[PDB]
Design a protein around this ligand. Sequence first.
Ligand SMILES: Cc1cc2nc3c(=O)[nH]c(=O)nc-3n(C[C@H](O)[C@H](O)[C@H](O)COP(=O)(O)OP(=O)(O)OC[C@H]3O[C@@H](n4cnc5c(N)ncnc54)[C@H](O)[C@@H]3O)c2cc1C
Ligand SMILES: Cc1cc2nc3c(=O)[nH]c(=O)nc-3n(C[C@H](O)[C@H](O)[C@H](O)COP(=O)(O)OP(=O)(O)OC[C@H]3O[C@@H](n4cnc5c(N)ncnc54)[C@H](O)[C@@H]3O)c2cc1C
Lengths: 338, 340
Amino acid sequence: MKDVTIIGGGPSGLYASFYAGLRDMSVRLIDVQSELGGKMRIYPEKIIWDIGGIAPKPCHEILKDTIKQGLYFKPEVHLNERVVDIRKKAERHFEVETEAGEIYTSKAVIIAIGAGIINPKQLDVKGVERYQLTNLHYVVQSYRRFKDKDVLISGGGNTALDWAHDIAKIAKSVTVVYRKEDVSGHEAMKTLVTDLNVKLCPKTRIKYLVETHISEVVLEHVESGDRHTVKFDDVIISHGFDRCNTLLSETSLDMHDDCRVKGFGNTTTSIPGIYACGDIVYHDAKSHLIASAFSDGANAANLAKTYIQPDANAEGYVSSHHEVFKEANKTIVNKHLY
Amino acid sequence: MKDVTIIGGGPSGLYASFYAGLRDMSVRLIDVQSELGGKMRIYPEKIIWDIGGIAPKPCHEILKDTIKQGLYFKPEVHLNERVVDIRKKAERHFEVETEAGEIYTSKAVIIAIGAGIINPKQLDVKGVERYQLTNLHYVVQSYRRFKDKDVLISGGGNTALDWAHDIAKIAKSVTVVYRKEDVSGHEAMKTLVTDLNVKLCPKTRIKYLVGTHISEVVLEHVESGDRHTVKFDDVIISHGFDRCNTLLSETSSKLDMHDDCRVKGFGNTTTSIPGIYACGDIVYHDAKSHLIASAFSDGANAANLAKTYIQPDANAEGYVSSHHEVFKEANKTIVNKHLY
Ligand SMILES: Cc1cc2nc3c(=O)[nH]c(=O)nc-3n(C[C@H](O)[C@H](O)[C@H](O)COP(=O)(O)OP(=O)(O)OC[C@H]3O[C@@H](n4cnc5c(N)ncnc54)[C@H](O)[C@@H]3O)c2cc1C
Ligand SMILES: Cc1cc2nc3c(=O)[nH]c(=O)nc-3n(C[C@H](O)[C@H](O)[C@H](O)COP(=O)(O)OP(=O)(O)OC[C@H]3O[C@@H](n4cnc5c(N)ncnc54)[C@H](O)[C@@H]3O)c2cc1C
């Protein structure tokens, strides 16, 4: 039987998997996506600067190292599987059940689900390669950059309609492309419907993206198939993250008022043996950063080790002098593999 | 007036400087060492694996990346200066004083001193280069690896004397070199002194490391100057950390202290005095680990909390770098020129 089941294969679950492996714990890692990476799979070409110790480079470059790290100790990885229920039969005996009816047993459970199911949209770039695009945005934080710009937003989700309203305050025009039939979310539209500079284009998708910036967008109607090319200055692809729509409403934990797992000072949850790491947990030391997802992962692995084996050391051995790496260290130095 | 004064140039102080710069804060970074890096300067050649997202590579390589990161926004760096006093005159008005009498003013103070003054011993390696050495150790965790080896330990601190006893259980012989007459504490020496395979060599220093791995050590007697060459299989240089001997016991501002001489963190890097924040190994909160990974996440939180202290109406957290406008000009060059 596996020592710990980690729910979520994002940076927090990946690092949690690594650090649990460093402490000689058996790990099962489950993620709903077809590939590991979590939210990092949404913005692969964007350059990340705020990860500690990592010189700026594409997210997809950093992700390859981070995935490898999560798998140093080679855990049992289960992709394309969606957890739907968590059960505590007894102390050090948990059942994790998927939607397909698969039941996995573990002595502890680490919940690293971020904000819920992530399903990155597959963008098709023509003329240029996606990796050199600069004016392609997957999140809006500062929006002063959109002054007098023609902005395209893909998706009719609540988040996309909220973005559209914020951007409309200073943008010249906003076009919201989505398919379905009519928008998702009543409240976002009542706010949005009074933005007289927002054009709604239902049943329409972004087809192709046409130096170092997107210059034109081919939009295409889902039914007729008619295409027309519109020039834009910035493109924003939403995905629709909505906390409060996770598995955590129907499992049987104390919840923060914003639908984050309430962390009791750290990654400790309201059930001994269940620990939450990453964006999903709230404690006073949390940041919405990859750096915090990592430090959360370590704490969840540490607390789970001492949960399974109370007399074990509180923390793991520093890797610089850890005996398991000694064989590899000689090869790295002799061959200059860095 | 400086926005924030950061005391300590380790990974926690380095990241805090960077993230404070990301939040458009003026930064002063002060450190007593002659080079930035803190504890990372003790084990430069050692391979570090447990830092998130970083493929294993030499500590000195990761340190180079971390220093560069701390200096993107080019803060005011004060090296070879040892802070001795912290004073809070009023809100958004702090005085940071060094031993030379220099007084630096800041609206907030970030304490990133780790465990206190770090002073790496300068090893002189002859025959080999230090960076490809494997049997040179700065910490002992697992000690089964020393089975039937001739081991040298430099330093007479409690930790070094503890290592010697533990290592002595299975090693062929242990030699403990140090310079003090007693190196303080009867019992650690008394435990070790009855390990009949341990040779205590007081008033003795390491002079030369002679060698992939070190094969022999040139030892020199202090005062007399006598040298003798001894072959060893492993060399362990201890440093002696004591969290109870920092400036925080004798300053003009009393933060609440944890019972282990760590700053009491009120859930995170918040301290008992608004405007003073502790990040890194120095602070205690329930989410702490004694890892470089935790020093980074502490630094971010400390930069965030200082920002909302100086500007209450500022955003609680900083903009994610992937979409942060300050990097956009550089991003095109990095992308266009494939600078990665
Ligand atoms: C656009 C964007 C840019 C960012 N840029 C930065 C940056 O530059 N620097 C930085 O420090 N931080 C950044 N962040 C912060 C971000 O939170 C982290 O990068 C990272 O996503 C942390 O997520 P996580 O570890 O909680 O896991 P996540 O990335 O949230 O992934 C969780 C994983 O669990 C899976 N999952 C969810 N529910 C279930 C379920 N029920 N069953 C099974 N699997 C499930 C998901 O599909 C996913 O694979 C950014 C965030 C976004 C959205
Ligand atoms: C894989 C791994 C291996 C590790 N191996 C080791 C190891 O072998 N040995 C070890 O000791 N740690 C080791 N660590 C711990 C790690 O190096 C530290 O946790 C890290 O350096 C934390 O940095 P910090 O800035 O919080 O503290 P520090 O690195 O100690 O930073 C303190 C800095 O502030 C300065 N300073 C202190 N007081 C003052 C003052 N009054 N005025 C001015 N400057 C001052 C110090 O000189 C120093 O530059 C390891 C960690 C990991 C993850």
